[PDB]
Design a protein around this ligand. Structure first.
Ligand code: AG7
Ligand code: AG7
Lengths: 186, 185
């Protein structure tokens, strides 16, 4: 069915090894992408509090911002600033500047149960609006793969671009929230 | 952590897309590797009967042979001949001819819940003998990855070599049965 490229697999591998951690909230375990310095991202439905477990180390959250567009609509991204010695590789230059469609993407998961899994998801479409668990959400990417709980937070990449994080699905399709350069560079 | 090469991921993807199906027995679902014609392999612990579900289509098993070496020891490979119109790409030339060690291997799964997932497992070592669920087993490959149930039948590959199928683990390590060219020729 779906296929990815060699450089695509190697690009995903480099992001996972250097820019992901296992995050655990009250709501469960999630893959977490670190973007730069001590700034990382996680789906809003994870309900981040004043503390979070990062690789099983409880870490103080210095700040969190649940992202909403100018229509005050959910984007399902929550940016968190972490009180933790280690800093992230700056990967902002891999973030897209515009909404777009993509071919042969890869979904990568980093949890305790699946500490290094890679899933080619195929063509990613700009789906736009989504009724996500009853919450209207915008800037959604869609792919036809039977995604599962525990893949939320998973990083979706193309060769050279980190395009989103997984946030939902219906049993036959997966949905990711867009990542955009403007969210982190202003 | 564990790492694989682009060519490694691309070879595994080609094997999965062309030479794997979802097999479901009374004992559960397993990844099933087709080797040539209508011949496929599955772990013996799947307890294959006279029928099997191949991609949710009940298929008549024409023959099955649970492999044991010349010491009459379990190998955990079962070769099945399937009553199935479509035939498999012959990939016998990718099978190793002898026991060996491998680097930066990949474990690939094709089940209903995880249809085509890829896991770098790192260095694969010829472990040899294993007491698998109380059954003495030979020709076992070992890799340090926390494998799980539902990854049994998963194909272990390196670029150009189909080296084994997953059959067990202990929570910190995974174990696969060797595949050898002599089994099919
Ligand atoms: C991962 C996160 C999770 O499980 O909950 C965290 C506490 C999970 C992944 C999906 C599960 C099933 N397959 C997946 O990929 N995410 C969720 O469960 C979100 C809610 C959903 O995905 C719902 N699906 C839909 O709403 C939907 C809409 C369409 C067109 O198709 N499906 C569930 C019914 C599966 C978690 C979430 C996010 C934002 C919210 F406002 C509420 C809930
Ligand atoms: C895959 C098949 C399956 O789950 O269905 C069979 C009921 C599963 C994979 C392992 C599960 C846990 N993690 C895995 O990778 N395979 C099994 O459960 C076999 C038995 C085992 O793996 C045991 N482990 C050991 O024996 C062992 C030995 C050493 C040195 O380290 N671990 C369980 C304790 C997990 C299934 C099997 C195969 C052949 C038999 F004769 C009996 C049982």
């Amino acid at each position: 069915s779906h296929m990815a490229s060699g450089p695509g697999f190697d690009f995903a591998q480099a992001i996972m090894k250097k820019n992901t951690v296992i995050a655990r909230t009250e709501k469960g375990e999630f893959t977490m992408l670190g973007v730069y310095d001590r700034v990382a991202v996680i789906p809003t439905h994870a309900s981040v509090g004043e503390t979070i477990y990062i690789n099983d180390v409880e870490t103080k959250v210095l700040d969190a911002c649940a992202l909403r567009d100018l229509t005050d609509t959910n984007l399902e991204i929550t940016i968190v600033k972490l009180d933790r010695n280690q800093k992230f590789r700056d990967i902002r230059h891999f973030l897209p500047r515009y909404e777009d469609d993509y071919n042969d993407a890869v979904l990568s998961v980093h949890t305790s149960k699946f500490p290094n899994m890679y899933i080619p998801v195929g063509q990613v479409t700009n789906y736009g609006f989504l009724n996500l668990g009853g919450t209207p959400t915008h800037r959604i990417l869609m792919y036809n793969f039977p995604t599962r709980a525990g893949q939320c937070g998973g990083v979706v990449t193309t060769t050279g671009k980190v395009i989103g994080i997984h946030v939902g699905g219906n049993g036959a399709q997966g949905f990711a929230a867009m990542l955009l350069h403007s969210y982190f560079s202003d």
